[PDB]
Design a protein around this ligand. Sequence first.
Ligand SMILES: O=C(O)[C@@](O)(COP(=O)(O)O)[C@H](O)[C@H](O)COP(=O)(O)O
Ligand SMILES: O=C(O)[C@@](O)(COP(=O)(O)O)[C@H](O)[C@H](O)COP(=O)(O)O
Ligand SMILES: O=C(O)[C@@](O)(COP(=O)(O)O)[C@H](O)[C@H](O)COP(=O)(O)O
Ligand SMILES: [Mg+2]
Ligand SMILES: [Mg+2]
Ligand SMILES: [Mg+2]
Ligand SMILES: [Mg+2]
Lengths: 465, 468, 349, 237, 119, 140, 140
Amino acid sequence: AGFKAGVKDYRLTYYTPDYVVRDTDILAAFRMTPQPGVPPEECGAAVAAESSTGTWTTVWTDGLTSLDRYKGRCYDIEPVPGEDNQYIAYVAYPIDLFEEGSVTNMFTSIVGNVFGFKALRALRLEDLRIPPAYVKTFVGPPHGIQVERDKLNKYGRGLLGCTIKPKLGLSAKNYGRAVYECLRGGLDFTKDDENVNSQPFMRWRDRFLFVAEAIYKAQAETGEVKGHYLNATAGTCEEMMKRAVCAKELGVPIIMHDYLTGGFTANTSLAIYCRDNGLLLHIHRAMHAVIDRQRNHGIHFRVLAKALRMSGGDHLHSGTVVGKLEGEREVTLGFVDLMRDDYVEKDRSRGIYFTQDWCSMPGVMPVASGGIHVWHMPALVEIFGDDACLQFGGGTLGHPWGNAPGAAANRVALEACTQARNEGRDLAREGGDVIRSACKWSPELAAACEVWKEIKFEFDTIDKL
Amino acid sequence: KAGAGFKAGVKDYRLTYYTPDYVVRDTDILAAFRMTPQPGVPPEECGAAVAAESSTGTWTTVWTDGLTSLDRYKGRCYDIEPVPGEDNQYIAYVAYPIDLFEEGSVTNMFTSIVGNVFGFKALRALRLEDLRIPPAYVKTFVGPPHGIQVERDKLNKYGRGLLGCTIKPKLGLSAKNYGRAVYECLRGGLDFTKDDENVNSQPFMRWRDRFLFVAEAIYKAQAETGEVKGHYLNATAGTCEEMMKRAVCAKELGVPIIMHDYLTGGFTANTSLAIYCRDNGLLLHIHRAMHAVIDRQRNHGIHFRVLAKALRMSGGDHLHSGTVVGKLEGEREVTLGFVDLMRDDYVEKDRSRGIYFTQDWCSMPGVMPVASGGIHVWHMPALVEIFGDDACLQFGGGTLGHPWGNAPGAAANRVALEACTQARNEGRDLAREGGDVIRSACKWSPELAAACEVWKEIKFEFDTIDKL
Amino acid sequence: AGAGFKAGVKDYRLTYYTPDYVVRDTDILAAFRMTPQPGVPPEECGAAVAAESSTGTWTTVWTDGLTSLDRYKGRCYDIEPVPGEDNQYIAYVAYPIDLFEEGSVTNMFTSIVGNVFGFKALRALRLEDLRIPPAYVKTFVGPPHGIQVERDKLNKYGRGLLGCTIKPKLGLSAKNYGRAVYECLRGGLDFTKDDENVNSQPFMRWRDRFLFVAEAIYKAQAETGEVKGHYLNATAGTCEEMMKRAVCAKELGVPIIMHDYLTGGFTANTSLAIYCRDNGLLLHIHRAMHAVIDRQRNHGIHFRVLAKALRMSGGDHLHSGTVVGKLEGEREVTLGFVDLMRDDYVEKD
Amino acid sequence: YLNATAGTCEEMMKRAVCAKELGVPIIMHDYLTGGFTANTSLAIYCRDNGLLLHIHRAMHAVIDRQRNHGIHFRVLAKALRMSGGDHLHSGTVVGKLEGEREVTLGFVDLMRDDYVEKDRSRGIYFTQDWCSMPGVMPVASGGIHVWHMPALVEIFGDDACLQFGGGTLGHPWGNAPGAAANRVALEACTQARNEGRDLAREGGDVIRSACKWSPELAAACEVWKEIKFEFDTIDKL
Amino acid sequence: IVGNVFGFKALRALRLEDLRIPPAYVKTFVGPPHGIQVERDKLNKYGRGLLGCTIKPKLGLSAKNYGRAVYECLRGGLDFTKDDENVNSQPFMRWRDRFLFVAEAIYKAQAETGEVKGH
Amino acid sequence: MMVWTPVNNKMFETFSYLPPLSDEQIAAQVDYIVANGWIPCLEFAESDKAYVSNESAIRFGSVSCLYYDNRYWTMWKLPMFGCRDPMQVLREIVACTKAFPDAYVRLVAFDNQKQVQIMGFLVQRPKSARDWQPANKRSV
Amino acid sequence: MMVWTPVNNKMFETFSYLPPLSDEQIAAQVDYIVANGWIPCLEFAESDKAYVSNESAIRFGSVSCLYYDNRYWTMWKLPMFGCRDPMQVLREIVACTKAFPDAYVRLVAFDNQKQVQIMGFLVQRPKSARDWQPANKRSV
Ligand SMILES: O=C(O)[C@@](O)(COP(=O)(O)O)[C@H](O)[C@H](O)COP(=O)(O)O
Ligand SMILES: O=C(O)[C@@](O)(COP(=O)(O)O)[C@H](O)[C@H](O)COP(=O)(O)O
Ligand SMILES: O=C(O)[C@@](O)(COP(=O)(O)O)[C@H](O)[C@H](O)COP(=O)(O)O
Ligand SMILES: [Mg+2]
Ligand SMILES: [Mg+2]
Ligand SMILES: [Mg+2]
Ligand SMILES: [Mg+2]
């Protein structure tokens, strides 16, 4: 009843195994590895405490408010199968603890300081249950999958993108030259590499203008709407906005932003600007692997994906599974659903720890990109379906005949796999046959197939369930 | 007749990106990567892959390379040193030409260096240990709004470490109760108090209400003590528009300092705020919330020293440095290392402290390290010995957890700090005579005696994860 | 084949009367006291109200097929008889959260009470209550400060606050207004206020009044040693004029302004409430015109709904009636909506 | 009419600005649910930027339905004319929403004319002099179809906008055919009136004659032939 | 120069006939937006006086009827037409409506005649 | 179901959705004008200026709202002020169409009290026009 | 090395890069629509209204982002709600092209759950059109 100075176990206040979670609570699933001698209950309580309302010693101020009302609560702990010192600690956070529409604030509490506690050796946030009452405080994505397709007037197949290469070193006009040749061959989009912002070899406004000429030339030539994600990622918000404004003034369809390296605060502002000005926003997840690669520590990508959907983004890279970058099939299928769907049921076999209700927030278009080529098309279409954008950078500018032929080869491979699927063919089994048949009438595809026929990326997976 | 032309297809990255005889230029940005290749992947190839996919190349040969000069722009793995006693670990050094980076953009720098390479299937783990920021690139940044010397000059405080304190409970307090706690803390001897990192604007307390009451608290405590006071008002928000509205309010109230969680808020937003603070005379305290998600493990991530350099470039007058002895992890040698990297103008390479490259800050302002987290009066001797006078030592629970309240709690910490500072100045060895200094002060300070009695038994000692 | 498009009229009840529907916790719920025309079944009348306040019209439209009516349609899920009335019923309607624009009371009212009150098929209709789910409540900024914060800013605790409307209503000059205000405040009243209809007129222009009132506020405060205030009326013909007045109050450093939320409107009120939050001004809300809507038992909108709407749009104060004064206000009903405007959780009663 | 009605004035203006930037001719606003303060501001913006402003009277029946309490619509109509609006729903008389003929003809005059003399037989209690203030276009909308055309033209004359929502998207052949059927019915009735025919008595014959050469109208007439809205009037003089 | 002196009791009448504006003072003024030469160069009209015409009746015409009269005037050979001095913005014709209809008239007449037109 | 054709199905406002007006129906509309004391007037335009367009907007800032070229047509002589003889109106239709046989011609009438055109319809379209459909071909 | 021709090589979105679909391949796509319970619908447009353009932007301020004319085509009758018979769809394609032999016609399908077009491809191109290339002439 009174104030008693001094230190006491966190579990006395923050371990509440009989707590009935509320439908407005934000829930967190932590893969926790305690230091030897630290009871799982105390470790879980410490996490809940230091990410909500408590500190290392008893403070009298608790008495001025109602700790029962605001405290985070570790309400359940389950051992990790096959792990001697690993547990999944579930924590419930009252909705009152979060600032409306601020992913930055949500992350600040949940992952702000707990990962550095001496009492634990490792910690990883696996999932978050974002309640509808909190989802509703966010503007969310500028447009979403359905609106995007409606604005581009594109339906019935996955969209095709392509990152211009070399990553850096090209002049503004050479960039536009590459873009035009890429788009004219059948690709829906092309894009600035994530690290292409504004540099000595190519200033941004010069690139924006030449790319604009390229987009419009390709569109007029093909009769299909074209786009190129112009990078607004910058050192300051003022610079980021100047770039978005220029895209608006040029009448182009889409820009991009590296949400993690730029930051959630900047990203949310940009997403809002895109909503109010009609610009599609492609989101690049640069730096994500720094945080989500290891199984024992960090934040799983599914959480980073939910966070982006909340902050706002029409596109979000999802991995390719079969490409040069890691992405295990089951967890990828899991977060792709979390990115696109309105309601996703709990499914541990896919790393989905909580049932997620998006309460009508627009879905984000997954982007499969990185070290993929024509022979991967069957698998890509089989894994993602039509609602995705498959990007081929090296897979286009690496074609022996140039960008246009390279683009046509990918567009042909995509439509052939799409046609076959619609006909009821099993892409997982007949993928190769579908591609080979297309090669008979498509010399562009035949050339691409011959160049990369033996190329595959198969390594031991680090990010395992 | 026919020179080097375009040949479609895949070839090893090492054929272009592994250059062991390359002589680094003084304008090159250097990176030290602790990499763990997948079985069967030569360190030369893995290293070349990292340099390639963080600079100019992709998985297959592109014809466009011929339109420019790859030799001029490509990143280069120029050296690979094996890591003793570790499981297939190597330190791969990569040099990046200055042309690859957007001036004054920490966001761009990170985008290239740590953008995609950490996810490659060809490697099992990767950790950026250090970065050599050349003077030519340092000069493209506005840097910290003020820096240590200017801060002391504006606050008119010299001769001792500064004292801070995080208000508690973390969340749940109303605006007026926040101001109440702040006033009581500051009037007792603390130089600063602050919003918890997660205190932004919430149902239980909206930001503008907090700013106003805190302002009253700041001015009351200052008038009462006759010493300049401050409270880091959190400008961290969901959008830049909200962030700026909060900074503008602090400016309009004439208060001395605000704070920002640079990692959860972001570099783009942080740089904008730092610039605003420079142009409006506001001190900017930086909280490193989320850093441990990235810098805790030895095998993967980014070491805090790099995150510290990044913040210094983006802009920050204060930056949490850890306590070493507190509730959060922070190995002594590693800590002393990045503290120098945060404050000094020139830091020589010293692997015994995790300093892989000699760093020249070319006169960019030094950042005030802030030791915070689970520390109390008995830790004072150790803290003063580790950090010296140029630091801010914060006691949240260590103040609001005092049995007599905030003012007495603040006095106890202020007394402990001044006693330790006096002892050191007189030539006493704090590492050895610390306890005696504190016990001696207890004789004439009832406030300190009470604090000492409550936390005498409390210590934080665990196996260190982030070892050199 | 399957369900197709069939042009023509059919009963609303076939699509909008769902007596077995289980309301979702995010649905906005409405309780309508409905009086159908003779010959019109209660379920059909309730169905019409649900349909015309959500997704349907008088005849079948083929466009329904492009979307999902099951997902968007309003549903009359319950019809309750009214004791002492054999032609009056309470019809309950559930509206999916997707039907509403976030943070817009204007939009919520446009759907629920937009057109259904004028249907020939019904003789009278009154909206008695609305269940605002937490998921929708969270989309609103809400009141600029609220009871606790207001008390903390004024430093007043332990007793009800005391106010006073200057009189005569109209006809006083700006200086005489300030004269009456100073004398009122210095005697013990915490606040005084512009009458609801005192905006800016020939006998007293607003800026002149604001200035003299400021002198009166500060003189009374200095004399008594207690924080004082006077609700300066920001109610105007246009939003531009409304904001100019709010800005002047901000510039004078005064504590509080007022707005007639119903005559000024929800759109204007919400904008003002947001301004007050970002500028630290307390906002007193006058309910002028409410009795035109909430007086009769058989038709209109009960004040409790108008109160919930104001709490959502934003207001630090809201007139609640006196029960014992010159204006009507039944005790039980009043106690009920007072809890609805002050408390965090109010059980059905 | 693109809707500018919003939760705040800032959002309302952003929508009006977008309409301006797109070069489109007209926007709308729910003056009672949005409010007079916001409406007056919007009307002023429309005057200064050349946008037509259609006003929807949502919520009016909450206030003007009962004969014993509230505010009669004629007063709400005068208020809107003053606040600002190029269009204002006036009811249909024969549609799904209530609107007694005499009362309606009365406030329609109060909405469009420059001078209206007292006339209690139409609920006009005072002679109203608008002193050249622009007239507001009455909009008859709600539960009306092709067969109502003769009555609508006879009631309102040419200066009005007749709206058919369900009456258009409810046509068995779709929106375009539904639109044509209403346009044909309107022109057929207009032509008949100009020729001196009495729409109050020959309306049905005018429509049937048009059906002979207009399959679109014929299909509409078939679907809604027996649809009428006749109930006891609440808002009686 | 003409502020108070005209009302002095000491005089019965006063009239300012002329003023000598010295170049030193003239130079302190921006002066006319363009001037005769520039005007002729912008309109591309030379060799004859310019022709204008005030629309009538002075007041009472609607915005569209104003544009109608303007178009018919300009298309016949007049270089300009104009608002009567007292035509500003009134109940019978608000200014912005007039500006829009007149613009249509100016452009129609110019396209029809091949000569630059204005109002 | 009949489909309303979007190809070469241009309309001309009032009465364009009815079968072509016979001379008798046209005369009746004229009687309507005279009976109401309205002011008859003919207007014409060449094919290229018959329908609204946006050409001039190229010279505009963001002020195209409700601005369209070709709304104004050319006046045939002057409005027939004081005309109380329909034969008079019919004779001018003949004279106008004779002078401009390949132009679009419409008959309108003005009300000077409300000061606005109160009626109007097309009376001539060039025989070369191929952008319209006969009554029985508006839907297929 | 073959060069992708930029001349008269207009495309038409989904499947336009594959050889012209045979009636058997079209029938297969239709079965796909029915098997998934999607709503079949046909749209058409004359040559001048077939590809995206920017004509309307002349009336805009700086808001042309993602705005293009000609995305909307004309609906053939109404979407075939309820249709569970592929033969019905195939017959409407014939009915539509019969009504408009000189117009572009495309078959689409709507999903009322996601409320978006879920599939689509061109079923008719005016025979007189020469702005496209057969599969064998796309590269030279
Ligand atoms: O820089 C690159 O490597 C890419 O442009 C791909 O180039 P290629 O098309 O030439 O491979 C993409 O950014 C990665 O796909 C990002 O990885 P992820 O999608 O995993 O975020
Ligand atoms: O939230 C907290 O725990 C604190 O307010 C300290 O509270 P106490 O003073 O009550 O411990 C600080 O933010 C941490 O010091 C941050 O960690 P670091 O300095 O490692 O970034
Ligand atoms: O919501 C509706 O019902 C309408 O769109 C009409 O639909 P239909 O054309 O399908 O009937 C109109 O808003 C009403 O006419 C308003 O009533 P009033 O005109 O009385 O204000
Ligand atoms: Mg890239
Ligand atoms: Mg903290
Ligand atoms: Mg009053
Ligand atoms: Mg004149």
